[PDB]
C-alpha cells in the first residue's frame, strides 16, 4: 500500500537488506532540547523549573522575609513569525512568573508570617523556537549549534613523552566540575604528588589532605600498608606476608622453622612465595641492616622521660633503633615502599610539605588562591569549605557524578553534587594505582568521555546566570525593604535576565546565522556538533588528535562530512540514526542479538557501552531467519574490527546508512567514491542554489524524502482529507471525519510563502503540487518548497553528460556546456536583494524623501511616483534611483538617495515602509525613514560560474557552446554537458561513473515509457512494462503491487515517469554492477554504458566509444558576477592613504607580501615602485600620475608613501626620535 503522493512517482528502490528501524525525525536534537527547556515538568528536572528551584525561595540574612515561588508561564507572542521577520523584532515570549512574598515577624523560623502578597510578575522575554528548529533573533533567522565538550568527572591523563626531556612519564588527574573550581593532581619527575587548583601555582598535594583534618598518621594509614617489627628475643623480628617479596633481591638470609628457605643473592620467585605460604612463614629474624633504610608509620614517645622518639614519616638508623628499643614500644610499624609496585610517593610528598597541622595547611592554600590580602582563620576556612563542599559554587552535575563514580569503579551512579573527603582521596588513590601499573589512562577523543551541550542546556545556564544576578538584587532590596509599601517589582527587575539571554542568543560563538540556501543545508546546519565555543578548544591552536576520527565515531558522528580548511574535524556533523543520551552522550541504535537469531528489537548504546559488547556489521548475509549464513562474521570488539564466530555476538548494526550523516548519505554510490571526494561532495552539496525548475534526481538514495519533509520547507498536511483549492492565496483542505474534531467543524488553510528572501539571497518559494479535489493523507506533502519536486529533494538538475576531452575547453576541471542548457532556463536561478534606505537626522535638520532630486536632471524622477520613491516593478539596473532621500543644507544640497548598486539589475518585487509616523505603522523608535526595497535579479548561467556533481567533481563552466557543435550520438540528440575523464583516475571518485551509467539506464526506461505513452498504447502494455521495470533483478524490497492501481494510477505514474524512471541506490547497500547492466538491457541501450558519438564540428565519428549518461549536476552559489571586480580610482580609507578593500566597498586588490617578493625576484624595480607608491599610497604621486596619464605621458613622479610617514609618527609618538638624514 502507498499514500497518494507516493503513488505519483514511486522510485525504483534497490537495496537487499530489509530496514528494521525507520529514520528518526532529523531535527530532534534542537526540538527535544528546547522542549526540555520550556516545559512545565514537575519533579524539577530538567528545565526552567530547575533554575527556579535552585534560586528560590530567597531569604535574606535574617531579614524576616522570604520570597518564594509558585509557578511560571509563557504568554502568547505578540508577533507571529512572519511579521516578526518582516518587522525586525525578536521572536520571543513573555515569561510570567508567579511570586509569593511572605514577610515574617521577629523570631519566626517556625512562626506564621505577618503578611503575604503575590503577583504574576514579568521577568525578561525568552526567544521561542520556530517549529523548524530556528530562532528569529533580530529579524534574521539564527541557529544554536550543539557543542561537544569534555564531560564533568575525573580524567586520568598521561602526557607521556614531551616533558622532562628524559622519557619519564607523568600522570595527572583532572576533576572537571560542571560549574565551579578545577582540581588537578599531578606527578613531577622527582616522583612527588602535587595539587593545583584552577591552573594556579603548584602545591604539594598532601596539604589538601592536611586541609581535610587528616593528621600524618591517618594519611599514612590510607596510602600505605604496615609492616610489623616485633621486639623479641633478638634482632627485632619481622612479620612477613610473602606477597611483599615479589620481584626483589634477597639481601639477607631467609630462614625460619630451623630451615634455610632462600639464601642471599637470588631474587625471590613466586615458587619461593608458594614455599613460604605452604611452610606458613610469617615471623623471621632480620639483620640490623634491614631496618636501617625503612620509614616509621606512626608516632612513638618515650614513656618515662615523656618526650618524642620519632615523628611519623621518619627514616630509621641504628641509633634511632637504640633510642626506640630501650624505651618500650615493642611494635614498630614501617611503610612498605615497594620499588616495583607500591611506591613511596605520598611519603616523599610529606617530606616536601612545609606544613604540619590543619591551620597552616589552610593558610598556605589561602595564600595560594587569593594572594596579598592576609590569611586569617575565618577567611581561609570559609574559602576552603566553599571551594568544593558547598552547593553554591561547586556542583558536579548528574553527568559528573556518574562519570566520577564510573571512573572509580563505584557501584552507585547517583549521589550528591559536591565532593567530599573520600572522593578526593579516591582520585589520589586511583592516580597512584595508575603510576604503580594497575589501571590505565583515559583518552579524550573517546565519545563516552565527551558530552553534548544543546540549546536547552546552554540557554538554561545563561538563564541561571541571570537568576543569580536577580537574587543578589532581591537580597539587596529586601534588607533595605520597608513593609508594607512595596510589591514584588520594586525588588525584582526584568533587566538582567533579558540582558543575559539576549547576550547569548545574539552574540555567542554558537548562536550563528543559518546557512539557508537549500533544504539540505538548513537540515544539516541544525544537526551540527561543534567542538568550539565557550569552554571548548579553539581553531588556531589544537591540534592533531582532536581533528582526527576515533573508533567511537561509528554511528554517532559522520566520518566524512566535516569542512575542509582551518577547522576540520571540529565542526563534525551528527549521524543519521544517532539520538542523544539522557546524560547528553551520543547513543546509536543497535539490534539486540540473543542467540543465532538476530532479533528485530533495537537497543541504544553509547561508546562506554559499545566497548564491552561485540557488535556486528550492517551487511552480513542472513537469510529468512536472522541466522548469520556464515559461521564467522566481521564485528568489532573494543574499537578493533576483527573476525568473530557465528555465535558470540550481542548486537548488530541497525541499517547500513547509520555511519554517515544526512549530507553525505544523499550521495549515491558513496561506497565507490574515495573518502576525500565524498567529503568535498557533501560540503559542496550544502552549497547549491535552488533552480527555477526543480528536477528529481534520477539516481538518488531514497533519503531525499525524509530530508525534504523533515526540514520544514514543504507544507506537509496536518490532517488528511480532500481539498477545496482556492490556492491563489492558500491551499484549503477539507478534513475527513475520523481525523476531525467534534466541535470546531474545521478545514485546514495552508499559507504558501511566495517569493521572498532567504538568508543567502536565494529565493524560497512554495508551489502547490496537488490539484483540486484530490485525496491527501496525514503526513503527506502539499506544497513543494525550494529545491523539492513532489516531496523529494531536487538540489540540482540531471543532464546528459559525455566523458571525453573536447578541444581543450574542459582542461583541468572545467566543464563544457551546450546551449540547450541555457536556452531552457534549466539553471536560471532567482536571487533577491533587500536594500534599505533611511533618512536619519544626522545634523543640520532631518533628511527628506522627495523626487525633487537636485543638480541631476530628468534622470532622477523616473522609476518613481509623481513626487517620490521607486514605483513598484520595472527592469531597474545599475545607477538607477529607488528612494529619493536627500536634505537641503547638508548648491549645498546633495544626493544620498539610495540607488541601485553597480552591476545589478532586477525587478522591484516588494516595498516595505513602517517609516517615521508621517510618510504619506508598527516598528521601534530612533530610526525615522525606513524604506526597504526588494530587488530580484534573475541570473542565468555564463562562462565562469561553478557547477558540481555529488561526488566532488568541481568545475568552472568554460565554454557555452551552440547546439550544433555538441557531440551527438547516432540517434541525433546532442549531449548536454561534457566533463573530463582525466579527473577520474587521479581523484578516485569512481562513483560518478556508476551514477552516469545508472542514470543513462533510468532515462532509457523513461524514453521507452515516453515512446509507449506518446505513440499511445492502451494501458495493458504500459502496466506490463512498468511491472518489468519494477521487478528487475535480484532480491529487493520494493517489488510493487501494480495491479491495484485502478487503471488510472498506472497512467498518472506513467505521466510522471516519462522524463526518466527514478532509481534509489542506497548508501552502502546500493545497486551492484550486474543490475546496472541488466537495467541497461531492459532499456534498449548498449550494455557497456558507452555509445559511439559523432562530432558536431566535423560530422565524423569519435574513435573508441565514449561514455554518455545522466549525472545530477548542481549549481553552487559561487556565481561569477558576484566575484568580478575592477578598480581604477575611487575612494580610500581615513587613517591610511591606500585604497579600501572589498567589493561592496569599491576597492582594489591587496598586493600582498609574497607578490612583493615575487617582483623582487624578477628585476621589476619600476613595476614595484609604482605598485607601492603611485598606484597605492602617495597622494601627490597619484594625482600627478592621473593627470600625466590623461595628458598622454606615462611617467611617475614617485615621492614618499604616506603610510611610512604614518609609521614615523607612530614610532615618534613613543619616546623614539626617528629621522631622515642628509640630502
Amino acid at each position: 500500500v502507498y499514500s497518494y503522493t507516493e503513488k505519483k512517482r514511486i522510485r525504483k528502490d534497490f537495496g537487499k537488506r530489509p530496514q528494521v528501524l525507520d529514520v528518526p525525525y532529523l531535527l530532534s536534537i534542537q526540538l527535544d532540547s528546547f522542549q526540555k527547556f520550556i516545559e512545565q515538568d514537575p519533579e524539577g528536572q530538567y528545565g526552567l523549573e530547575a533554575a527556579f528551584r535552585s534560586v528560590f525561595p530567597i531569604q535574606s540574612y535574617s531579614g524576616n522575609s522570604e520570597l518564594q515561588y509558585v509557578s511560571y508561564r509563557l504568554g502568547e507572542p505578540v508577533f507571529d513569525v512572519q511579521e516578526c521577520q518582516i518587522r525586525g523584532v525578536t521572536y520571543s515570549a513573555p515569561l510570567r512568573v508567579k511570586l509569593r512574598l511572605v514577610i515574617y515577624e521577629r523570631e519566626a523560623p517556625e512562626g506564621t508570617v505577618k503578611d503575604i502578597k503575590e503577583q504574576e510578575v514579568y521577568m525578561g522575554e525568552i526567544p521561542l523556537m520556530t517549529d523548524n528548529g530556528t530562532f528569529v533573533i533580530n529579524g534574521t533567522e539564527r541557529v544554536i549549534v550543539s557543542q561537544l565538550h569534555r564531560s564533568p568527572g575525573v580524567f586520568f591523563d598521561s602526557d607521556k613523552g614531551k616533558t622532562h626531556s628524559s622519557g619519564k612519564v607523568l600522570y595527572n588527574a583532572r576533576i572537571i566540575p560542571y560549574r565551579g573550581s578545577w582540581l588537578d593532581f599531578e606527578f613531577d619527575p622527582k616522583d612527588n604528588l602535587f595539587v593545583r587548583i584552577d591552573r594556579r601555582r603548584k602545591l604539594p598535594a598532601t596539604i589538601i589532605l592536611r586541609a581535610l583534618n587528616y593528621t600524618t598518621e591517618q594519611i599514612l594509614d590510607l596510602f600505605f600498608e604496615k609492616v610489623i617489627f616485633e621486639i623479641r628475643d633478638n634482632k627485632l623480628q619481622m612479620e612477613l606476608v610473602p606477597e611483599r617479596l615479589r620481584g626483589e633481591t634477597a639481601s639477607f638470609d631467609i630462614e625460619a622453622n630451623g630451615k634455610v628457605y632462600v639464601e642471599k643473592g637470588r631474587r625471590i620467585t613466586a615458587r619461593h612465595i608458594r614455599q613460604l605460604e605452604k611452610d606458613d612463614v610469617k615471623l623471621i629474624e632480620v639483620p640490623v641492616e634491614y631496618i636501617a633504610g625503612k620509614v616509621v608509620a606512626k608516632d612513638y614517645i618515650d614513656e618515662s622521660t615523656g618526650e618524642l622518639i620519632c615523628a611519623a614519616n621518619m627514616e630509621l638508623s641504628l641509633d634511632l633503633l637504640a633510642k626506640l628499643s630501650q624505651s618500650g614500644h615493642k611494635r614498630i610499624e614501617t611503610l612498605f615502599t615497594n620499588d616495583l609496585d607500591h611506591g613511596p610517593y605520598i611519603s616523599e610528598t610529606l617530606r616536601v610539605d612545609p606544613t604540619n597541622d590543619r591551620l597552616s595547611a589552610l593558610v598556605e592554600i589561602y595564600r595560594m588562591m587569593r594572594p596579598g590580602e592576609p590569611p586569617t582563620r575565618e577567611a581561609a576556612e570559609s574559602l576552603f569549605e566553599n571551594l568544593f563542599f558547598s552547593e553554591d559554587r561547586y556542583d558536579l552535575s548528574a553527568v559528573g557524578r556518574m562519570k566520577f563514580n564510573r571512573s572509580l569503579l563505584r557501584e552507585e551512579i547517583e549521589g550528591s553534587g559536591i565532593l567530599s573527603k573520600d572522593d578526593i582521596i579516591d582520585v589520589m588513590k586511583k592516580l597512584i594505582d595508575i603510576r604503580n601499573g594497575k589501571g590505565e589512562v583515559d583518552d579524550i577523543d573517546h565519545l563516552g568521555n565527551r558530552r553534548i551541550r544543546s540549546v536547552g542546556e546552554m540557554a538554561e545556564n545563561q538563564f541561571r546566570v541571570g537568576l543569580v544576578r536577580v537574587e543578589r538584587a532581591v537580597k539587596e532590596r529586601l534588607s533595605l525593604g520597608d513593609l508594607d509599601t512595596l510589591m514584588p517589582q520594586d525588588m525584582i527587575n526584568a533587566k538582567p535576565i533579558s540582558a543575559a539571554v539576549k547576550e547569548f542568543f545574539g552574540s555567542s560563538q554558537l548562536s550563528q546565522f543559518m546557512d539557508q540556501n537549500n533544504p539540505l543545508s538548513e537540515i544539516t546546519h541544525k544537526r551540527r556538533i561543534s567542538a568550539l565555543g565557550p569552554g571548548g578548544l579553539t581553531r588556531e591552536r589544537a591540534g592533531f588528535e582532536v581533528r582526527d576520527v576515533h573508533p567511537t565515531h561509528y554511528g554517532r558522528v559522520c566520518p566524512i562530512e566535516t569542512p575542509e580548511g582551518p577547522n576540520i574535524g571540529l565542526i563534525n556533523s551528527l549521524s543519521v540514526y544517532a539520538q542523544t543520551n539522557e546524560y547528553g552522550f551520543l547513543e546509536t541504535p543497535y539490534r539486540k542479538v540473543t542467540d543465532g537469531v538476530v532479533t528485530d528489537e533495537i537497543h541504544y548504546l553509547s561508546a562506554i557501552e559499545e566497548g564491552n559488547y561485540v557488535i556486528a556489521q550492517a551487511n552480513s548475509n542472513l537469510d529468512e531467519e536472522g541466522h548469520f549464513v556464515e559461521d564467522l562474521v566481521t564485528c568489532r570488539s573494543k574499537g578493533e574490527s576483527s573476525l568473530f564466530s557465528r555465535d558470540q555476538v550481542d548486537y548488530m548494526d541497525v541499517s547500513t546508512q547509520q555511519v554517515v550523516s544526512v549530507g553525505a548519505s544523499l550521495i549515491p554510490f558513496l561506497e565507490h567514491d574515495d573518502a576525500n571526494r565524498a567529503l568535498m561532495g557533501a560540503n559542496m552539496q550544502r552549497q547549491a542554489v535552488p533552480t527555477l525548475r526543480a528536477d528529481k534526481p534520477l539516481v538518488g538514495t531514497g533519503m531525499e524524502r525524509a530530508v525534504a519533509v523533515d526540514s520544514g520547507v514543504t507544507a506537509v498536511a496536518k490532517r488528511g482529507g480532500v481539498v477545496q483549492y482556492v490556492d491563489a492565496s492558500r491551499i484549503v483542505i477539507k478534513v475527513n471525519e475520523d481525523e476531525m474534531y467534534p466541535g470546531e467543524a474545521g478545514i485546514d488553510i495552508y499559507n504558501l510563502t511566495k517569493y521572498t528572501r532567504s538568508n543567502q539571497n536565494t529565493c524560497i518559494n512554495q508551489m502547490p503540487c496537488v490539484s483540486l479535489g484530490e485525496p491527501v493523507e496525514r503526513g503527506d506533502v502539499l506544497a513543494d518548497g525550494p529545491s523539492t519536486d513532489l516531496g523529494e529533494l531536487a538540489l540540482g538538475q540531471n543532464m546528459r553528460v559525455a566523458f571525453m576531452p573536447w578541444n581543450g575547453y574542459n582542461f583541468e576541471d572545467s566543464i563544457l556546456v551546450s546551449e540547450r542548457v541555457v536556452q531552457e532556463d534549466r539553471f536560471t536561478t532567482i536571487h533577491i536583494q533587500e536594500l534599505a534606505c533611511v533618512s536619519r537626522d544626522t545634523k543640520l535638520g532631518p533628511e527628506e524623501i522627495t523626487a525633487d532630486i537636485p543638480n541631476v536632471g530628468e534622470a532622477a524622477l523616473s522609476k518613481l511616483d509623481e513626487s517620490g520613491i521607486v514605483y513598484i516593478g520595472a527592469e531597474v539596473t545599475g545607477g538607477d534611483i529607488l528612494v529619493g532621500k536627500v536634505t537641503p543644507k547638508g548648491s549645498d544640497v546633495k544626493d544620498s538617495s539610495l540607488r541601485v548598486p553597480n552591476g545589478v539589475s532586477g525587478t522591484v518585487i516588494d516595498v516595505q515602509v513602517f517609516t517615521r509616523d508621517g510618510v504619506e505603522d508598527d516598528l521601534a523608535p530612533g530610526v525615522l525613514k525606513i524604506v526597504k526595497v526588494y530587488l530580484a535579479v534573475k541570473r542565468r548561467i555564463q562562462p565562469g560560474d561553478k557547477m558540481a556533481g555529488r561526488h566532488g567533481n568541481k568545475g568552472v563552466i568554460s565554454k557555452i557552446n551552440p547546439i550544433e557543435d555538441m557531440p551527438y550520438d547516432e540517434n541525433g540528440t546532442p549531449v548536454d554537458i561534457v566533463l573530463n575523464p582525466l579527473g577520474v583516475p587521479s581523484r578516485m571518485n569512481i562513483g560518478q561513473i556508476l551514477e552516469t551509467h545508472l542514470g543513462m539506464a533510468a532515462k532509457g526506461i523513461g524514453d521507452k515509457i515516453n515512446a509507449m505513452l506518446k505513440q499511445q498504447q492502451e494501458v495493458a502494455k504500459l502496466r506490463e512494462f512498468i511491472q518489468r521495470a519494477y521487478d528487475l533483478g535480484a532480491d529487493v524490497r520494493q517489488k510493487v503491487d501494480l495491479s491495484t492501481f485502478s487503471d488510472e494510477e498506472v497512467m498518472r505514474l506513467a505521466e510522471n515517469l516519462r522524463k526518466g524512471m527514478p532509481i534509489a541506490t542506497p548508501v552502502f547497500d546500493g545497486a551492484k554492477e550486474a543490475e546496472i547492466k541488466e537495467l541497461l538491457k531492459l532499456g534498449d541501450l548498449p550494455t557497456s554504458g558507452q555509445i559511439r558519438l559523432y562530432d558536431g564540428r566535423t560530422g565524423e565519428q569519435f574513435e573508441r566509444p565514449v561514455t554518455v549518461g545522466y549525472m545530477y549536476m548542481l549549481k553552487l552559489n559561487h556565481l561569477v558576477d558576484d566575484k568580478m571586480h575592477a578598480r581604477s580610482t575611487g575612494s580610500y580609507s581615513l587613517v591610511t592613504q591606500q585604497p579600501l578593500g572589498g567589493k561592496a566597498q569599491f576597492g582594489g586588490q591587496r598586493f600582498g607580501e609574497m607578490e612583493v617578493w615575487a617582483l623582487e625576484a624578477y628585476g621589476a624595480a619600476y613595476t614595484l615602485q609604482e605598485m607601492l607608491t603611485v598606484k597605492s599610497d602617495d597622494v601627490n604621486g597619484r594625482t600627478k600620475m592621473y593627470k600625466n596619464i590623461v595628458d598622454g605621458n606615462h611617467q611617475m613622479e614617485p615621492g614618499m608613501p604616506e603610510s611610512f610617514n604614518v609609521l614615523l609618527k607612530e614610532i615618534r609618538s613613543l619616546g623614539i626620535n626617528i629621522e631622515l638624514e642628509d640630502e
Binding site: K1209, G1215, N1217, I1218, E1219, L1220, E1221, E1223
Partner: protein, 105 residues
C-alpha cells in the same frame, strides 16, 4: 633626496620641538553637535583647523589671509592634512619610565 634613517632617544627638548601645543583637557569632542573641544585632546590652536583654510568657528572664508588667529577662535589657518603631521605633548605631572626600556628582555 635622503640617505640613511637615524633612530635615537627623544629628549624632552626634542619632544617640545616636535610639538605644537600642550594637550591639557581629556575632553574629546562636544558629541551633541559637531565641534571639538577647546582646548582638549582634539584642539584647534594646538593643532589646526578641521576645514581647509577656514577658521572652524568664524572668520576667513576666501583665500587672502591664511594664518590670522583671532581670540574668539584660538585656531590656526592651514590644509586638511596639516593635522596629520602635527603632534601634541602631555606634560606628565609625575615622571614615568618607558616600558620598552624597562621590560625588553
Amino acid at each position: 633626496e635622503f640617505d640613511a634613517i637615524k633612530i635615537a632617544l627623544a629628549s624632552p627638548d626634542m619632544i617640545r620641538s616636535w610639538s605644537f601645543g600642550e594637550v591639557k583637557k581629556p575632553e574629546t569632542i562636544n558629541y551633541r553637535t559637531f565641534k571639538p573641544e577647546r582646548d582638549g585632546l582634539f584642539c584647534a590652536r594646538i593643532f589646526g583647523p578641521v576645514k581647509d583654510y577656514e577658521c572652524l568657528c568664524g572668520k576667513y572664508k576666501r583665500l587672502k589671509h591664511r594664518g590670522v588667529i583671532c581670540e574668539k577662535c584660538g585656531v590656526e589657518v592651514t590644509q586638511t592634512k596639516v593635522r596629520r603631521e602635527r603632534m601634541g605633548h602631555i606634560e606628565l605631572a609625575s615622571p614615568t619610565a618607558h616600558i620598552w626600556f624597562l621590560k625588553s628582555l
